[PDB]
Amino acid sequence: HSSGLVPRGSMESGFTSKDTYLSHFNPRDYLEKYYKFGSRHSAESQILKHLLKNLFKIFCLDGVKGDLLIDIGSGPTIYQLLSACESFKEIVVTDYSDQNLQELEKWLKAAPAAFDWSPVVTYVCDLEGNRVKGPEKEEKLRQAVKQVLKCDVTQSQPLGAVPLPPADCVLSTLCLDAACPDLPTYCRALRNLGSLLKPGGFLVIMDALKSSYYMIGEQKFSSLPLGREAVEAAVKEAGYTIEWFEVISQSYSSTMANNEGLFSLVARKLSR
Ligand SMILES: Nc1ncnc2c1ncn2[C@@H]1O[C@H](CSCC[C@H](N)C(=O)O)[C@@H](O)[C@H]1O
Ligand SMILES: N=c1sc2cccc3c2n1CCC3
């Protein structure tokens, strides 16, 4: 009840509480704000294209492939899985928010009222060489998504008591910044995701740099404002070896975030 002075759910602890993600996170509004293919060459649209070109390169051009991929903190989105369904036989989607899981389930069932991913899907098809059209690509993704589960990156068992085989890849886009109030929790969340991975499994992360908040309309949500060095240090202390790390300077529209670019990394679960 602070009226934009401070992010929603943070007056007491300094960071957006996770119950705020069950009450004030609107899936439909988050999708309209950031994913109606951003907008007409907007900062959001350029960022989405850059995210899509990196996932295509990681999954289709590089050696990131296997049986199971677990997407962590998927929200109501599926763009991050379009290229991945080409390298992984099965995908599991997860989020802390029940309204985000409902939105994902609406898309899985191709409910007419669901969000339209068509332009994003066609862009991914174009990147992959136009071997299939959008509608064929979406059905391949829908059949590959085997489970839609509740997730909490802060718990030692992120997926609760749900048994899954060790994953070949753990993917997490624009989630860890929103979920982790500090670097010790951020480091611990990367250790928690490690328990879902086979020894030597891939960890794929894409998030924002130096961002202390992000907006969903006039609703402000916290983000951990960490830099490249702090990201690399936390990924290494969580028990991972970084294969590649990229940083772009492109930031979100001034009215939606205060970030200083984005990062992408592909890491591998260490020996121990
Ligand atoms: N502790 C927690 N554990 C898991 N997910 C969490 C979480 N706290 C927040 N989240 C989720 O983190 C997401 C931030 S939005 C990221 C959505 C999507 N992956 C994309 O690329 O746009 C939300 O869906 C929110 O529910
Ligand atoms: N989901 C999204 S969109 C966006 C823009 C800028 C910063 C962040 C952000 N997130 C969560 C992490 C922090």
Author numbering: -9 to 262
Cite, word for word, the article reporting this structure.
Nicotinamide-N-methyltransferase (NNMT) is a cytosolic enzyme that catalyzes the transfer of a methyl group from S-adenosyl-methionine (SAM) to nicotinamide (Nam), yielding S-adenosyl-homocysteine (SAH) and 1-methylnicotinamide (MNam). NNMT is the major Nam-metabolizing enzyme, and systemic knockout in mice fully prevents MNam formation. As was described by Peng et al, NNMT possesses a class I AdoMet-dependent methyltransferase (MTase) core fold, comprising a central seven-stranded β-sheet, flanked on both sides by α-helices. In addition to the MTase core, there are two extra α-helices at the N-terminus, which, together with the β-hairpin Y203-S212, form a cap over the active site.
The crystal structure of the hNNMT complex with the HTS hit shows a very similar binding mode as for inhibitor. The NH group of inhibitor forms a hydrogen bond with the side chain of Tyr20 and also with the main chain oxygen atom of Leu164, and there are van der Waals contacts of the inhibitor with the side chains of Ser201 and Ser213. The 3-methyl-4-phenyl-pyrazole group of inhibitor (1) is located in the nicotinamide binding pocket which is occupied by (2) in the hNNMT complex of inhibitor (2); inhibitor (1) occupies both the SAH- and the Nam binding pockets. Based on the X-ray crystallographic data of our hits (1) and (2), the question arose as to whether the introduction of an appropriate 2-hydroxy-2-methyl-propionic carboxamide-based linker on (2) is able to transform our nicotinamide pocket binder into a true bisubstrate inhibitor.
